[PDB]
């Protein structure tokens, strides 16, 4: 599925994003954009190593879910990496969570630094009602 701006940026409210861990839901709105353009279908193989990045926000099955072709990888969301494939974006979600859990925080996502970091992310959220 491919949202649209406000219609995830809704979602993510209920699903309780907004400052989980001190990140603000327009930041979660600007890596989802940066990451896969807010769609949750995206798949990236990464031929240098071995593993492949999943979903919206494009997590990478050497550490977040299992897709038993990558190797030394761990599971750390408990997830088969077809969960983070969904419509429902649930359980994508729910692993987002547990990377922000870690030291890194929003940081864990390269693409967060590139294009989010320190530069005015309000344009995600405008108008949504969010």
Known sequence: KVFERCE????LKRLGMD?????????????AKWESGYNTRAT????????TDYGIFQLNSRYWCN???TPGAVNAC????????????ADAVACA???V???????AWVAWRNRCQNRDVRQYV????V
């Open 97 to 99: 969570k547990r990377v």
């Open 101 to 107: 859990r870690d030291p890194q925080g929003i940081r």
């Open 126 to 129: 405008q108008g949504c009602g």
């Open 19 to 31: 400052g989980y861990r001190g990140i603000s839901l327009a930041n979660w709105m600007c890596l």
């Open 67 to 69: 897709d038993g072709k």
């Open 8 to 11: 995830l940026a809704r979602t």
């Open 44 to 51: 990236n193989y990464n031929a240098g190593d071995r593993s």
């Open 78 to 89: 408990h997830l088969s990496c077809s969960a983070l494939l969904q419509d429902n974006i």
